[PDB]
Amino acid sequence: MEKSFVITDPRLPDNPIIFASDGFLELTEYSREEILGRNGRFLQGPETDQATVQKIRDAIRDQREITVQLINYTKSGKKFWNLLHLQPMRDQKGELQYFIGVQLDGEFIPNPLLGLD
Numbered sequence: 001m002e003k004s005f006v007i008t009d010p011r012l013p014d015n016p017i018i019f020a021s022d023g024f025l026e027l028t029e030y031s032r033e034e035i036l037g038r039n040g041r042f043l044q045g046p047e048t049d050q051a052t053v054q055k056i057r058d059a060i061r062d063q064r065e066i067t068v069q070l071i072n073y074t075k076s077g078k079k080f081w082n083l084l085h086l087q088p089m090r091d092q093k094g095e096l097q098y099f100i101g102v103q104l105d106g107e108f109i110p111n112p113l114l115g116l117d
């Protein structure tokens with residue numbers, strides 16, 4: 001698929017998605033128009049590990065890049081493993097301007113290893 005990513009605006013409440021790539025639409029099965037303005041957690045669901053969610057939340061607060069692997073859901077309810085790479089984007093003034101999150105679909109690290117401390 002074309003590279004899956006979204007861009008959020010941390011200068012607006014709770015990181016709304018301001019851009020979603022064609023690859024993200026293809027991976028997730030959502031339309032662009034229905035994605036825009038959402039927080040990226042809309043892809044989560046019952047099987048998503050809340051400990052991994054908390055890691056993300058801490059990295060966003062700290063404006064620190066992070067990679068995690070977590071369960072996400074397509075619009076039709078299909079589960080997929082998402083290796084999510086989140087990167088803060090700063091402007092020339094050093095000010096946070098965007099986050100970008102790139103999704104790679106796959107159980108790259110087997111669940112039994114991911115689950116160790």
Ligand SMILES: Cc1cc2nc3c(=O)[nH]c(=O)nc-3n(C[C@H](O)[C@H](O)[C@H](O)CO)c2cc1C
Nearest residue numbers: 008015039040041043044053056057099100101
């Ligand atoms: C740019 C960006 C992209 C994100 N993409 C995803 C994603 O693909 N899947 C997901 O489960 N959470 C994603 N999140 C994390 C989610 O929005 C939220 O920050 C965490 O669930 C903590 O509440 C993303 C966050 C940002 C800032």
Ligand SMILES: [Cl-]
Nearest residue numbers: 014015039040
């Ligand atoms: Cl967010």
Ligand SMILES: [Cl-]
Nearest residue numbers: 015056057060
């Ligand atoms: Cl958050």
Ligand SMILES: [Co+2]
Nearest residue numbers: 093094095096
């Ligand atoms: Co300033």
